[PDB]
Amino acid sequence: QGTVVTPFYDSLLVKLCTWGMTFEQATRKMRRNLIEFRIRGVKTNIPFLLNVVRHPDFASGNYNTSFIDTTPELFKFPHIRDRGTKTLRYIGNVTVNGFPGIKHRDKPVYAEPRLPKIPYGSQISPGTKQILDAKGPEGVVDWVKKQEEVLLTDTTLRDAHQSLLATRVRSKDIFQIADAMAHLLPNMFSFEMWGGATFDVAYRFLNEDPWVRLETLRKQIPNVMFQMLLRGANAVGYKNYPDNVIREFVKQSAQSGVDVFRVFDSLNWIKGMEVSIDAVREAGKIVEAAICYTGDIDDDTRTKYTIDYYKDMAKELVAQGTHILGIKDMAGLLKPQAAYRLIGELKDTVDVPIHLHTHDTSGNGIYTYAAAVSAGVDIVDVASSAMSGATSQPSMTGLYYGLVNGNRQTNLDAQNSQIINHYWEDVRHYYKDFDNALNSPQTEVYIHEMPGGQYTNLQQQAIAVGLGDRWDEVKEMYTVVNQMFGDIVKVTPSSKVVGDLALFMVQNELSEEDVYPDSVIEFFMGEIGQPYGGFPETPLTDRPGALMEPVNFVEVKAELKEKMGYEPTEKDVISYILYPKVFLDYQEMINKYGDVTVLDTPTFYKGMRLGETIEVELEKGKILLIKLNSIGEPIADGTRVIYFELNGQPREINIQDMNV
């Protein structure tokens, strides 16, 4: 173990001989032995010897001096990844340089999350999925209409963490609970688990495959239906795309496990949504065309967004065809009194079931739902207590105890939902670095009408600009900018456009009067779509999605295969199309460190403490015991050796320090 090889004398480490009654027997033993050898610190000729010993002409026993040289294959060696080493590279790296984007801090001693025990062989109680499997979309919508109670959709795996924790919740932590979700929340109408920002963030910040997340869950939770959120125009993309990719995306998603598709356009223009909605009907899956709520219906000062306007728009979406009509209140603006009016007035206006999404920023989240339940709405979005509140949805368990003995109710085992909560209560601590959300009712929301995500994201840019001292000035300027384009529906990506300019005006001290950026021109072009009012002040004229010409899937599929190490799957290709810069970046990162999805979250973000030992499951039955003993001292160029025990065997790897 200790020895150092000098170059002065010959290269020989050990002579390995094997014996057998038959040479064929001996060759076998030689093979095994050569593989079994573990020598690290220096290169060896083993992989060469293996190739010669594996070669069939060697096993024949008929060879000659000219056997090597004549055969070149022996000199071609398999490109072997050790997942193990690359895992230590990651762990060692974040241990010395830290995780990007967060203060380098010691890895805490997180409490072990409380997992629910399930009795063996229990349950599997059938879910709402069965009803889609059996009787298609219509047959579900029927069963919906039939239910007197209020139906719940659990957004604990999306929005909830998208709002609170920057969408940073990792698949590893999600999968762990999914079993219990099937056992203990079967009566849920749906689980919202995909879409919105999760897609790009998984690849961008987590180095996880969203497609995996989907499919792995799909198996864990067969009973309950899966729901996602889709920006009709550009799906989950950042930019606009041609219509074939959209239809392709939705096809895949439906195949992989997505059952209900809440789809919205950021401007509430039904033209942008058309492409994607048809794909879902053509997928044979549920469409929840949803109306994004802005302004105030009960305050009549504002002419543009009247209770009529939402009644009218809902007609045209039933006409365009939608199995369900959802109302996406992305900011928390639907005051509870307005909700009583809107549900009652829309149940009158149209026959479809109704599904409501609101954010508890205001403190009136649960009350706004009680108004809806009084007015007889079918489905609402909630999350586990421990991930409810603030910019999240209202507590599922909160709502139940709210409606418990009223005329109308919601059927969930209280105690169950609490057991699920106990897990999340414990898990959220892993993400304290990302838990920058404000923890009291922010009533100011009604003035600025800015979605929870946007408040924090725009605070960040002002802090970046160094206007954090003037932050209050930006918030007001923003409201003017919406008022400059009349009154427009502020929501991603339209929200971004207002904020981008607001920040410009306040930066250059320009009043609205004084007035007389790429993203803003694209708004005035019509690349986001068509503003309902159609404010005045070259012509986009029509939907950018349609105007786009399609790139052949095969030309790209080959482009990627050449870019990537190997032949891609159908899913890998769409992802590349939608997010090309990030997808390669994701690939390059996965090659360097291997599949990180697997590491426990604390280790992923905090690396390892000294003398700590952890286990990581790379695959069923393949566990790495890993201990960190000590960290080497830096040398000239900053490099230092980290001292590990992978599987009890000491190992050593170099990580380059970034700052002494």
Binding site: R28, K29, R31, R32, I35, E36, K620, G621, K622, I623, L625, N647, G648, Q649
Partner: protein, 183 residues
């Protein structure tokens, strides 16, 4: 190699490793099993796959969790199970239980372990084969000190065995109480 593509090694330590070595020499995939106290033992790293077995169990009990092992065997895709020596090597229930689940058991048929299970039923099986045997009690010596009568007839010195040594006389008392209690 024909119908065994993959094999589970229902043991630990030296013997476990030897088996793995044999399999790999025969292009057969291998699966290891380790107790909580054996997360460290390097027999588990020498296999192609490995799983913990005796969860919460006392350390020796862990490698005898028959049922667990079969679930592990089934989940693994293991065509067969090699029990090595000691532990479940001779346990009938396990042997049988493999046959029940159609897992090949590397060793004799359970009928063979049954006949040789106890030392007495083997010594019995030895006469049937017609080979030399030690002169002893025709059944298990169920009577305590029934020996002295049996001892009087044959020898001054006698050994006592279960499924300790005696020179006759007074020693007979002292040897049995501890022999049968030790057993």
């Amino acid at each position: 190699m024909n119908r065994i593509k993959k094999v589970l090694v229902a043991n630990r330590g030296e013997i476990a490793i030897r088996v793995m070595r044999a399999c790999t020499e025969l292009k057969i995939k291998t699966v290891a099993i380790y107790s909580q106290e054996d997360t460290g033992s390097f027999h588990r790293y020498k296999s192609d796959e490995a799983y913990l077995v005796g969860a919460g169990k006392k350390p020796i009990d862990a490698y005898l969790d028959i049922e667990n092992i079969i679930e592990i065997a089934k989940e693994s895709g293991a065509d067969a199970i090699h029990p090595g020596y000691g532990f479940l090597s001779e346990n009938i229930e396990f042997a049988r239980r493999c046959e029940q689940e159609g897992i090949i058991f590397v060793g004799p048929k359970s009928k063979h372990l049954d006949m040789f299970g106890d030392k007495i039923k083997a010594k019995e099986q030895a006469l049937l084969a017609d080979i030399p045997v030690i002169p002893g009690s025709n059944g298990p010596v169920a009577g305590i000190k029934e020996v002295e009568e049996f001892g009087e007839k044959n020898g001054y010195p006698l050994m006592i065995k279960a499924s300790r040594v005696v020179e006759s006389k007074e020693h007979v008392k002292e040897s049995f109480e501890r022999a049968s209690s030790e057993a």
